[PDB]
Design a protein around this ligand. Structure first.
Ligand SMILES: CN(c1c(N)n(Cc2ccccc2)c(=O)[nH]c1=O)S(=O)(=O)c1ccc(F)cc1
Ligand SMILES: CN(c1c(N)n(Cc2ccccc2)c(=O)[nH]c1=O)S(=O)(=O)c1ccc(F)cc1
Ligand SMILES: CN(c1c(N)n(Cc2ccccc2)c(=O)[nH]c1=O)S(=O)(=O)c1ccc(F)cc1
Ligand SMILES: CN(c1c(N)n(Cc2ccccc2)c(=O)[nH]c1=O)S(=O)(=O)c1ccc(F)cc1
Ligand SMILES: [Cl-]
Ligand SMILES: [Cl-]
Ligand SMILES: [Cl-]
Ligand SMILES: [Cl-]
Lengths: 293, 296, 293, 296
């Protein structure tokens, strides 16, 4: 079966104002590319080509202008809007008809991932055709997130959203795979005390049915924080260090498409043309002739 | 028969494709430098020079976004007006585009991607602003002067030549992106012919003032930071730099609300209203603290 | 068979003076711990407990004071000196009697590694009981290093040290595993045009015999640069971002020992005592009661 | 019957176990801040104040390493002497340990882990150094004044109290780690009794001057950077900050060779000799460039 993707790139309220007064966070750069390139690249690494992008009513034209219909990158992009920030699960209501009868995967528009064999970690989540797969990652501040509690045997036994007193230091990352059950689970959700349709309520629905796979995302992966000005800066510094050391880019969608064999050498060459005078075009050109393992 | 204050221009137009793809969805001057939009810094810089009437020049695509962020200036005791530069034809064009805005007044041009920091910056700007005749620029020692307008000095310290992006610079002293002009500038600008790059050059403007003995070049000392936003790397260094100062001090660099409050262009009651819609984030809480604390 | 380790923490000349005028680079911190903790931790992750540390004649007391005989961390540390910086291969001459008849592994004292499943990448190199295993990593500046050339089939066909015109962008990292042949290969080496006993000559010796395994260290690993002031700063910023995000440390030797089960809970507790008032002791204490996957 | 220049002290002793294990093998003041040892910055700071006779106070373990780095000062036109602090008994102890070094002279105490940057810093130091009677300190607005000596001001700006690490600070104005004293300091220091932390407090010393009407507290403006080296995080921010300024400018912060050359304590011939053993790295190449270039 096929899996479809959703990037939720909606409003972060006034939290980062005035930096985000003018445009939504996910259109701002992390180092050399718009933030949304990173979760888009994530979906593409998981082998997902049909992708729905959800943003504020103000910002859809801007994502649409940036990304197009995706055909240039061998993707099929569609767009939809979240009128108000009423919770992550709302992605599945807005995205209901896009999903139709397929498998799905939700990625948060402001989450960055890096690590060895990230392709396979996604692939093993993508392969599971029933139930939901999520990731748990050790963090210093688990109160900010969906917290997963494990028993002595390592089995996930509870989930709590932003608990006052967290049960472990393991947080559910912003990457979620679901089967055909998600839409129907989402539609039955009731708004939380914070007025939000909670993604953690969707994930707890699968947990009660014993259908939630919680895979550990090991300490050798970087799940980067874009929630504060400070953490945003750290993410830019982290990506810059990696790219300048290696002469290789992180989350370059044109490169990912090309390695997935969704575009051929001749298309990459055309994509390399408009940016030819800067480092990004120079990078895409160099990928035509170099072997990178 | 006919019978002086200074107006400001911020040029925040198209930085071309140079920083694509990071700048595909928005112009550079709306990207943040740490906790605030880049345009806040040159705006705060004009304000520090005592300038309240300011023209913002941007692309047709991005003007509404600048307008949404900044308004007409009334919240901050300013008057902000808007003009478009449909085609990126060079910095000097600001004066053709801003001709009617300028009228018969003195003026100041600042690049919308330029950040400054340092002690007695107010007084440095004040002395350039008080000089009512001729032009005033600032020379700053940089590693890579080939990237800029470069000023050559003689033994006595007098500026004797200006060159734009010379391959072999005569000194390491670059002209910063901040410029003060008398009433002659618009006319100088109209008589310019495009360079062999298809651009109306600010260096040709400054040379004109120099050839007439009316260019003052003041040194901006090594104790000031004139920060680079020309690359992705330098942009990142710029944010790290502001963050270090702000987290150290508990004070902000280029907070426009604060600067208007200190110039006495808005009062305590007005600052309070400015603080309210941001009361739950660090920026609003900072505006509120300014109401009770004495900061020397 | 057993494998023994050598950390070469010798002189970097005047290259970083005056920052390194007072003490050798490998005794300076990267973020929260002395640099040498990182390659030491690397050896320990590869399961190596008997370790020789080589430094300048001036700096051995300082390493000796810092690290002791290792018994507190379940290691067996010995020390030796490199009188002059006459090449990396000299590690095997100085280290000849330490190595005796065993397998060995050399790590450079100023190299930092991070990534998912780094333990297994080392383990698979450590398992090979014959020949030499090295790693190749894509870098922007291959002229600075030992450059490995691959044929269309991906087989390593040449090695050149600091070539004027490098054949690929793949550099041999500062981590090397050898069998019993290394000492004898090293002893027959002749000084290069730069007056150095070249590690690349040792590795080319195994290559000619077809006994050099060149494993790719993928782009999902970070091999960090400590060669310049700028790169040293980047390494500190990179480690700080990882540790503050996760609440977990990179290359904490006490933790690594404890997870390898070379020290028990009661010993970790004693190690946590002197530093109790700072974050490092607080970290070691917290490791007594928390489950970390 | 008996019948004024100023001596300097740098305290670069034990920072305890606080930054262990990073500081297990060497003391903090020899860790680099970017391209140079931390001790270079306070050393350059004393030099900028015109002080040439300087006592370095370190642990018995690390004195030889300070001596190996710095020598007797003769290469840089200074005279450097050494003393040990066997036990970390508090900052004021510098004056008991440095009593014979000081003699009948004025003095200046600087913390060996403190970095300063900004425009007309020379003149700010000059005005503190010229005041021959009483003591001089600097107050700087910080986010976390609870960590420092905190000065309270009245409506007219007069300093009226000093508190060491108060839980509820009276202002955000911290006393920086740079202190100028007349001849009374040693005696004040000898009469101090240890605090309820087992330490001889510089704040008790400064309070003594204040209780006598002889403490001048000058504001160090927000346009100066007074950088934090108290944590691993702030140390990293410190190096990022120097690197940004130096890579921007093609000039160094706190290069002692340069500062002595500019004070005229060494001449061109001497600077050249200093440049030679480092001719192949960036630091030596920088010393050589200083011989031919005019830097304003
Ligand atoms: C560094 N990574 C990376 C890669 N590993 N690759 C190689 C790769 C490309 C396609 C399929 C499998 C591997 C890339 O072409 N681009 C990359 O950015 S990654 O897999 O950890 C990654 C990929 C996408 C993303 F959004 C974040 C990190
Ligand atoms: C740190 N600086 C600064 C200040 N000195 N002040 C105080 C001040 C405010 C108005 C007049 C004189 C001084 C501020 O209110 N905000 C500031 O950012 S500054 O002069 O170096 C400056 C000011 C404006 C700007 F855009 C960049 C730097
Ligand atoms: C982040 N890493 C790491 C770990 N993965 N672990 C977990 C671990 C510990 C022992 C054996 C296998 C795994 C640690 O205890 N400390 C670590 O620093 S690492 O394997 O990539 C590593 C380990 C040692 C080192 F020097 C650099 C990086
Ligand atoms: C950037 N500064 C500086 C300088 N201004 N100068 C120029 C200078 C040198 C001697 C006297 C007056 C000025 C330097 O030669 N080195 C410097 O680091 S500074 O005044 O802010 C300074 C000086 C010494 C120090 F330790 C830290 C900062
Ligand atoms: Cl892992
Ligand atoms: Cl200056
Ligand atoms: Cl990889
Ligand atoms: Cl100031």
């Amino acid at each position: 079966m096929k899996r479809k993707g959703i990037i939720l790139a909606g409003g972060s309220g006034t939290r980062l104002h005035p930096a985000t007064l003018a445009i939504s966070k996910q259109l701002l750069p992390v180092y050399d590319k718009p933030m949304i390139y990173y979760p888009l690249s994530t979906l593409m690494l998981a082998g997902i080509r049909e992708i729905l992008i959800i943003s504020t009513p103000q910002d859809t034209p801007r994502f649409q202008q940036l990304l197009g219909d995706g055909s240039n990158w061998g993707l099929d992009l569609q767009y939809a809007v979240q009128p108000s920030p009423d919770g992550l699960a709302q992605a599945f209501l807005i995205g209901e008809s896009f999903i139709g009868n397929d498998l799905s995967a939700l990625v948060l528009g402001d989450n960055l991932y890096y690590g060895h064999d990230f392709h396979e970690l996604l692939g093993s989540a993508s392969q599971r055709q029933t139930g939901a797969s999520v990731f748990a990652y050790h963090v210093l501040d688990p109160e900010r997130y969906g917290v997963v509690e494990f028993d002595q045997g390592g089995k996930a036994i509870s989930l709590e959203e932003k608990p006052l007193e967290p049960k472990s230091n393991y947080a559910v990352t912003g990457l979620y795979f679901y089967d055909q059950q998600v839409v129907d689970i989402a539609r039955d959700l009731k708004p939380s005390p914070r007025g939000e349709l909670e993604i953690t309520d969707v994930n707890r629905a699968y947990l009660e049915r014993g259908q939630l796979s919680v895979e550990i995302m090991g300490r050798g992966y970087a799940w980067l924080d874009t929630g504060t000005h400070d953490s945003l800066l750290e993410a830019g510094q982290f990506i810059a260090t990696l790219e300048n050391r290696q002469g290789l880019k992180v989350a370059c969608p044109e490169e990912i498409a090309y390695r997935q064999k969704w575009i051929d050498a001749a298309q990459l060459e055309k994509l390399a043309a408009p940016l030819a005078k800067n480092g990004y075009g120079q990078y895409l050109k160099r990928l035509l002739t170099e072997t990178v393992y």
